[PDB]
């Protein structure tokens, strides 16, 4: 038989060591990012409103995940006599995560559209379209999320049902949460970088956009380090739940990898403030005075 | 200079009664 | 020059249908609302229908409601009146009347003429005729049911004159203002419920039938015809 | 000079803070507003916008009564005839266009196209139904009759470009400010300058006449306004603030002359107390530089026009 | 609101609809202000494709308006502030000319260093370049320019030196890009270059709007 007492004995303390300062830093970081960008919606509306919309959307998704962190923290060691608090916490956790993912993907798509066709989007770019896009992002996340956690439930974020790890509910997750967003991020970043570097022949002043050729090159990077191992662990765990990998000293390592990747992906709510919000000079001057 | 200033003050005081911007007009009388 | 020419009339059997057309040459027809005003034989004027400049607001008369249609053709600069299920009381002398509504505007100025024969504020003038020798000022009085004075200081009273064998022309608009191209002898005054028209001198041109109309609300009701003659 | 204006006016009680609110906002133009003029009826106003548009409004009900396209988009000034039949316009085309609003056709057409100024037209103000006074960037002013269009009298003597022009209530004299940091008082009937004043150290951008016709306050780009008296032949008082470092685009005087309204380049306007030489009110609500500012004939409302394509009526 | 006030309100609604119908054209319009010289060849350049002229045309379904102010241009800031909304400023120079290079450089420095056009890109055209090679062969460059370094008889070196001297007048580089071109008096491909530069300026505007940096 396979006993997972050691991996759990280690992973409890690992969560207690990594997640607490992650939540502590992310809470203040998002509470500063939101207030910092709320100024641009009251005094710099016609210029930066379109960006501030999805920026604030991403910030509030990160804040929702940060606030959901301490509840799984509490319910990772003790059981509360309630079958609804775990469901609510799981739903909030995963909704915030896969909402931030979609928001980042849409940010990359919007940048690529604004770059590839500047004259076309000089007219068809208003905060009404972006408000509708954020609304449909929330709507799609909720409708694709609730019918998953409705079939989850002895503890919280442990021992999922035997239909949660089925092909009909795991393949859509992998396809719609990693494959397509990663491909879109890669295309919309590589094409944008190549286009922005091809401005050298148009005008020698391309050096004026040096920073613009690095921020996207950061976006294409901190996205891999916070989403690739997590879905790799998801795929491995799905592999070991339908009679494909059965051996001791291996399933333990896969459980450890998946738990650790899920504990380390939660620092993306803290790395997104540096990726997107801190590379903006106006943000730096606004929050530092 | 003093005479011109005195005349300006006298003209201002004479016509100060009919300044709708200086004295808040009532809403009923407000156009 | 302004020229409204109306055609399409004639003799119609009872219960039939017809179309009256009006060309509007010599002015910006797109910016002017249009009215239809008929005149029964040996009778006064009565408003029929009205269409705005943009053909957005359309008004009819209770007698012709659901029976008359009014349409505008801006590219062709024409006005159309389609009449169906006619009765013997539809015999009149239709006129197309210009109008335009902004601040300081003077609607109901230019008219026309056409003939059709078929086989509510109360405005009336009790005096059928006012014979008077020339040389002395003549006063014409018109009575109203409601008060034409508005809260903004406007009095929607209209004084028109029709000469024998001619078409009506606007004398005074809004009870206190004279239309362009009019002698200075004419004047108008009055209170909110009472009005009066004063003529300083009388000539062969001034003899005719005077009419009073209100524009406070639709339908617009004419008064009686005061026959000023020597 | 014996006694300063401030010394005499020290005995006068301060006016205090006045709050003027936007009763109605006039919108519909698609570009920056460059000029406006108040009609004699105190209800109709004409405004010019750099999208080549002229709009006459109904200030009481925010009703668009007239909308006239312009031949040249680069228009800097507009005017309203005292009798209310014609409107004037001008700009970079060195031509003053007079439009007649009472055509029997039902539309508004250009009554005349006066030409003859070397530079761009910078101000036009009607004298009567058949006369107009204009100023140009060729450092001169002119008097025109619209019956023929010939320059009845050309006023020369300005070194820099003339910027603003205002007419006396009696319509017999006027004053003009230019870029030579000086203001000249001209006589319509005579035709040569009589008084010249040089107190500012920068280009004068606006000028206006006191309602009594014996004094005038003018503003320049040095963020100061200065009041001059015709009989005194000397500067009376300077209205300026340390926090104000932006030039003055327009000026206007109240009916009694107690409150002087001046538009600045800091996205708002100020209401100074002329006698007390102290700030009295602030007109804010424009998200761009205010270009034109006008006090109505009755003294009830005040109209302001800025670069945000919005016109604001205050009371 | 009486029966006649409703009609006035309807007329105002029609007028407002007419004004709003053309609000797309003013946004779609692309403005280029021409600030060439007398000997630069502005008249010939215009014919190939204070009197204020406006030339309106359409390139690739994009409306372009060129404002020519040749004849009289004032130095007052009020006059120049009328052109703060133009998309680009075109500066035409005579490459083959020798004595007028300093005056054109001074004019370019005065135009660029003004705060009015801080949000306007600058396009540079060097016309009559077919005679430039003959002029540089007959008379060298180092004679008329002490600071010049390189081969005085190399056309590429002369063009690079001219471009560097023109671009050195830009006090600030962060505001908007500065472009350049070399065309003759008989070529008919300047419209494509103008459209490309306008597209580059629009892309820069969108990049600044996206707050990517
Ligand atoms: C349409 C796309 C977007 C829609 C919104 C997002 C919806 C989906 C969100 C992701 C849900 C993915 C499924 C849950 C994964 C998870 O959080 O999984 C817990 C892991 O821990 C795996 O462990 P699990 O399968 O629960 O069971 C082990 C014990 O937990 C452990 O303690 C023991 O040691 C082991 O042997 C196992 O028994
Ligand atoms: C998971 O839950 C099932 C169903 O109750 C149970 O049989 C199994 O032992 C549990 N696994 C654990 C607690 O590791």
UniProtKB/Swiss-Prot annotation, chain A:
Please list the residues annotated as glycosylated: 159
Q: Does the keyword Methyltransferase apply?
A: no
Q: Which UniProt keywords apply?
A: Cell membrane, G-protein coupled receptor, Glycoprotein, Membrane, Receptor, Transducer, Transmembrane, Transmembrane helix
Q: For this UniProt entry, which segments traverse the membrane?
A: 14-34, 51-71, 87-107, 130-150, 169-189, 220-240, 260-280
Identify the residue ranges that face the Extracellular compartment according to the record.
Answer: 1-13, 72-86, 151-168, 241-259
- Please give, as recorded in its UniProt entry, the membrane topology of this protein: Multi-pass membrane protein
Tissue occurrence: Expressed in the caudate nucleus and putamen, but not detected in the hippocampus, thalamus, pons cerebellum, frontal cortex of the brain or in the liver. Expressed in osteoclasts and osteoblasts. Higly expressed in macrophages and B-cells.
Give the UniProt record's GO annotations in the biological process aspect: bone resorption; G protein-coupled receptor signaling pathway; negative regulation of osteoclast differentiation; phospholipase C-activating G protein-coupled receptor signaling pathway; positive regulation of ERK1 and ERK2 cascade; positive regulation of Rho protein signal transduction
Signal peptide start and end residues: none
Asked if the Swiss-Prot or TrEMBL record annotates the protein with the keyword S-adenosyl-L-methionine, the reply is no
Cytoplasmic domain ranges by topology: 35-50, 108-129, 190-219
PANTHER family in alphabetical order: G-PROTEIN COUPLED RECEPTOR, G-PROTEIN COUPLED RECEPTOR 55
What protein family is recorded? Belongs to the G-protein coupled receptor 1 family.
Q: Spell out the note in the miscellaneous section.
A: The classification of this protein as a cannabinoid receptor remains a contentious issue due to conflicting pharmacological results.
Q: What is this protein called?
A: G-protein coupled receptor 55
Q: Which organism is it from?
A: Homo sapiens
UniProtKB/Swiss-Prot annotation, chain B:
Source organism, top-level taxon: Eukaryota
Tissues/organs with expression: Expressed in fetal tissues, including testis, adrenal gland, brain, white blood cells and brain.
| Cellular localisation | Cell membrane
What function does the entry list? Guanine nucleotide-binding proteins (G proteins) are involved as a modulator or transducer in various transmembrane signaling systems. The beta and gamma chains are required for the GTPase activity, for replacement of GDP by GTP, and for G protein-effector interaction.
Q: What's the subunit arrangement here?
A: G proteins are composed of 3 units, alpha, beta and gamma. In this context, interacts with GNB2. The heterodimer formed by GNB1 and GNG2 interacts with ARHGEF5. The heterodimer formed by GNB1 and GNG2 interacts with GRK2. Forms complexes with TAS2R14 and G-proteins; these complexes play a role in the perception of bitterness. Component of the TAS2R14-GNAI1 complex, consisting of TAS2R14, GNAI1, GNB1 and GNG2. Component of the TAS2R14-GNAT3 complex, consisting of TAS2R14, GNAT3, GNB1 and GNG2. Component of the TAS2R14-GNAS2 complex, consisting of TAS2R14, GNAS2, GNB1 and GNG2.
Q: Record's family?
A: Belongs to the G protein gamma family.
> Protein name, please?
Guanine nucleotide-binding protein G(I)/G(S)/G(O) subunit gamma-2
Organism source for this protein? Homo sapiens (Human)
Swiss-Prot record, chain D:
Q: Where are the WD repeats?
A: 21-69, 70-115, 116-156, 157-198, 199-242, 243-284, 285-315
Q: What is the effect of changing residue 81 to T?
A: In MRD42; decreases receptor-driven G protein activation; decreases complex formation with gamma subunit; decreases trimer formation with alpha and gamma subunit; no effect on protein abundance
The entry's stated outcome for residue 27 to G is: In MRD42; decreases receptor-driven G protein activation; no effect on protein abundance; no effect on complex formation with gamma subunit; decreases trimer formation with alpha and gamma subunit
Task: Give me any GO biological process, just one.
Answer: cellular response to catecholamine stimulus
Renumbered to this chain, the signal peptide range is: none
Keywords, sorted A to Z: Acetylation, Disease variant, Host-virus interaction, Intellectual disability, Phosphoprotein, Repeat, Transducer, WD repeat
> Changing residue 93 to G: reported impact?
In MRD42; decreases receptor-driven G protein activation; no effect on protein abundance; no effect on complex formation with gamma subunit; no effect on trimer formation with alpha and gamma subunits
**Among its keywords, does the record have Phosphoprotein?**
yes
Q: What is this protein called?
A: Guanine nucleotide-binding protein G(I)/G(S)/G(T) subunit beta-1
Organism (species):
Homo sapiens
Curated annotation (Swiss-Prot), chain E:
Gene Ontology terms: cellular component: brush border membrane; cytoplasm; cytosol; extracellular exosome; focal adhesion; heterotrimeric G-protein complex; melanosome; membrane
Domain of life the protein comes from:
Eukaryota
Q: Where does Mg(2+) bind?
A: 43
Topology relative to the membrane: Lipid-anchor
Could you tell me which residues belong to the region G4 motif? 123-130
Task: Name the organs or tissues of expression.
Answer: Expressed in testis, including in Leydig cells and in the seminiferous epithelium, in differentiating cells from the spermatogonia to mature spermatozoa stages and round spermatids (at protein level). Expressed in 99.2% of spermatozoa from healthy individuals, but only in 28.6% of macrocephalic spermatozoa from infertile patients (at protein level).
Q: What PROSITE patterns does its record include? A: G_ALPHA
Task: Cite the residue spans of the region called G5 motif.
Answer: 183-188
* Keywords assigned by UniProt, alphabetized: Cell membrane, Cytoplasm, GTP-binding, Lipoprotein, Magnesium, Membrane, Metal-binding, Nucleotide-binding, Nucleus, Palmitate, Phosphoprotein, Transducer
- InterPro entries assigned: Gprotein_alpha_12/13, Gprotein_alpha_su, GproteinA_insert, P-loop_NTPase
Q: Which GO terms describe its biological process?
A: adenylate cyclase-activating G protein-coupled receptor signaling pathway; adenylate cyclase-modulating G protein-coupled receptor signaling pathway; branching involved in blood vessel morphogenesis; cell differentiation; in utero embryonic development; platelet activation; regulation of blood pressure; regulation of cell shape
Report the subcellular localization: Cell membrane; Melanosome; Cytoplasm; Nucleus
Q: Which family does it belong to?
A: Belongs to the G-alpha family. G(12) subfamily.
Q: What is this protein called?
A: Guanine nucleotide-binding protein subunit alpha-13
Q: Which gene encodes it?
A: GNA13
């Amino acid at each position: 038989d396979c006993l997972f007492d050691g991996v759990n004995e280690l992973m409890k303390t690992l969560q207690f060591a990594v997640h607490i300062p992650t939540f502590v830093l992310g809470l203040l970081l998002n509470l500063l990012a939101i207030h910092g960008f709320s100024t641009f919606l009251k005094n710099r509306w016609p210029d930066y409103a379109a960006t501030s919309i999805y920026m604030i959307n991403l910030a509030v998704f990160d804040l929702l995940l940060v606030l959901s962190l301490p509840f799984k923290m509490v319910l990772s060691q003790v059981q509360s006599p309630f079958p609804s608090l775990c469901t609510l916490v799981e739903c909030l956790y995963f909704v915030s995560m896969y909402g931030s993912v979609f928001t980042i993907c849409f940010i990359s798509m919007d940048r690529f559209l604004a770059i590839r066709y500047p004259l076309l989007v000089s007219h068809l770019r208003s905060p009404r379209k972006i408000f509708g896009i954020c609304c449909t992002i929330w709507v799609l996340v909720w409708t694709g999320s609730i019918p998953i956690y409705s079939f989850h439930g002895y503890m919280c974020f442990h021992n999922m049902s035997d239909d949660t790890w089925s092909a009909k509910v795991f393949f859509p997750l992998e396809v719609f949460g990693f494959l397509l967003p990663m491909g879109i991020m890669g295309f919309c970043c590589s094409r944008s970088i190549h286009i922005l570097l091809g401005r050298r022949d148009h005008t020698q002043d391309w050096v004026q956009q040096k920073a613009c050729i690095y921020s996207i090159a950061a976006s294409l990077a901190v996205f891999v380090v916070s989403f690739l191992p997590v879905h790799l662990g998801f795929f491995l765990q799905f592999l070991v739940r339908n009679s494909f990998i059965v051996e001791c000293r291996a399933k333990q390592s896969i459980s450890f990898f998946l738990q650790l990747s899920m504990c380390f992906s939660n620092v993306n709510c803290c790395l997104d403030v540096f990726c997107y919000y801190f590379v903006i000079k106006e943000f730096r001057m606004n929050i530092r005075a | 200079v003093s005479k011109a200033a005195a005349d300006l003050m006298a003209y201002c005081e004479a016509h100060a009664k009919e300044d709708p911007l200086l004295t808040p007009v009532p809403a009923s009388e407000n156009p | 020059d302004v020229q409204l020419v109306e055609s399409g009339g004639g003799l119609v059997q009872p219960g039939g249908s017809r179309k009256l057309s009006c060309s509007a040459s010599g002015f910006a027809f797109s910016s002017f609302g249009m009215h239809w005003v008929r005149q029964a034989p040996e009778k006064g004027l009565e408003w029929v229908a009205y269409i705005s400049s943009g053909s957005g607001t359309i008004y009819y008369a209770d007698t012709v409601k659901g029976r008359f249609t009014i349409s505008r053709d801006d590219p062709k600069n024409t006005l159309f009146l389609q009449m169906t299920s006619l009765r013997s009381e539809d015999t009149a002398m239709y006129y197309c009347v210009r109008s335009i509504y902004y601040y300081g505007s003077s609607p109901f100025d230019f008219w026309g003429g056409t003939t059709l024969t078929v086989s509510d504020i109360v405005m009336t003038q009790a005096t059928s005729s006012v014979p008077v020798t020339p040389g002395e000022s003549v006063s014409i009085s018109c009575r109203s049911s409601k008060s034409l004075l508005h809260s903004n200081g406007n009095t929607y009273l209209y004084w028109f004159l029709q000469r024998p064998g001619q078409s009506p022309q606007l004398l005074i608009y809004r009870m206190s203002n004279l239309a362009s191209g009019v002698p200075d002898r004419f004047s108008g005054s009055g209170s909110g419920t009472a009005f009066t028209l004063t003529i300083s001198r009388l000539e062969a041109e001034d003899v005719g039938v005077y009419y009073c109309m209100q524009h406070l609300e639709y339908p617009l009701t004419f008064g009686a015809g005061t026959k000023l003659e020597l | 000079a014996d006694a300063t204006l401030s010394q005499i006016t020290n005995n006068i009680d301060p006016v205090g803070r006045i709050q003027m609110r936007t009763r109605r906002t006039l919108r519909g133009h698609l570009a920056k507003i460059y000029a406006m003029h108040w009609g004699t009826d105190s209800r109709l106003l004409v405004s010019a916008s750099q999208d080549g548009k002229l709009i006459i409004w109904d200030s009481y009900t925010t009703n668009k009564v007239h909308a006239i396209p312009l031949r040249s988009s680069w228009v800097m000034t507009c005017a309203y005839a005292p009798s209310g039949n014609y409107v004037a316009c001008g700009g970079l085309d060195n031509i003053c266009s007079i439009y007649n609003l009472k055509t029997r056709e039902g539309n508004v057409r250009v009554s005349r196209e006066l030409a003859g100024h070397t530079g761009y037209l910078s101000c036009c103000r009607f004298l009567d139904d058949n006369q107009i006074v204009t100023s140009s960037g060729d450092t001169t002013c002119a008097l025109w009759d619209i019956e023929t269009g010939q320059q009845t009298t050309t006023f020369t003597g300005h070194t820099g470009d003339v910027m603003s022009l205002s007419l006396a209530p009696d319509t017999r004299l006027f004053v003009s400010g230019a870029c030579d940091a000086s203001a000249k008082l001209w006589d319509v009937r005579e035709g040569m300058c009589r008084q010249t004043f040089t107190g500012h150290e920068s280009d004068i951008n606006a000028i206006c006449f006191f309602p009594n016709g014996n004094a005038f306050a003018t503003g320049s780009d040095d963020a100061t306004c200065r009041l001059f008296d015709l009989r005194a032949d000397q500067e009376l008082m300077t209205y300026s603030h340390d926090n104000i470092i932006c030039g003055i685009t327009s000026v206007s005087f109240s009916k009694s002359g107690r409150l002087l309204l001046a538009g600045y380049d800091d996205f708002n306007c100020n209401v100074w107390d002329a006698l007390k030489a102290d700030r009295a009110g602030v007109l804010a609500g424009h998200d761009n530089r205010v270009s034109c500012l006008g006090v109505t004939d009755d003294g009830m409302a005040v109209a302001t026009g800025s670069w945000d394509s919005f016109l604001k009526i205050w009371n | 609101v009486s029966a006649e006030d409703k009609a006035a309100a309807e007329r105002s609604k029609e007028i407002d609809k007419c004004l709003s119908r053309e609000k797309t054209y003013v946004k779609r319009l692309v403005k280029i202000l021409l600030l060439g010289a007398d000997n630069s060849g502005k008249s010939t350049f215009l014919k190939q494709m204070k009197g204020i002229h406006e030339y309106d045309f359409e390139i690739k379904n994009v409306p372009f308006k060129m404002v020519d102010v040749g004849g009289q241009r004032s130095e007052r800031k009020r006059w120049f502030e009328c052109f703060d909304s133009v998309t680009s400023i075109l500066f035409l120079v005579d490459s083959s000319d020798f004595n007028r290079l300093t005056e054109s450089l001074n004019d370019f420095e005065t135009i660029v260093n003004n705060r009015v056009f801080s949000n306007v890109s600058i396009i540079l055209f060097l016309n009559k370049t077919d005679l430039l090679e003959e002029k540089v062969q007959i008379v060298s460059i180092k004679d008329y320019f002490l600071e010049f370094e390189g081969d005085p008889h190399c056309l590429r070196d002369v063009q690079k030196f001219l471009v560097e001297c023109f671009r050195n007048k830009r006090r600030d580089q962060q505001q908007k890009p500065l472009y350049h071109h070399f065309t003759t008096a008989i070529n008919t491909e300047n419209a494509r270059l103008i459209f490309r530069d306008v597209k580059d300026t629009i892309l820069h505007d969108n990049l600044k709007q996206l707050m990517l940096q």
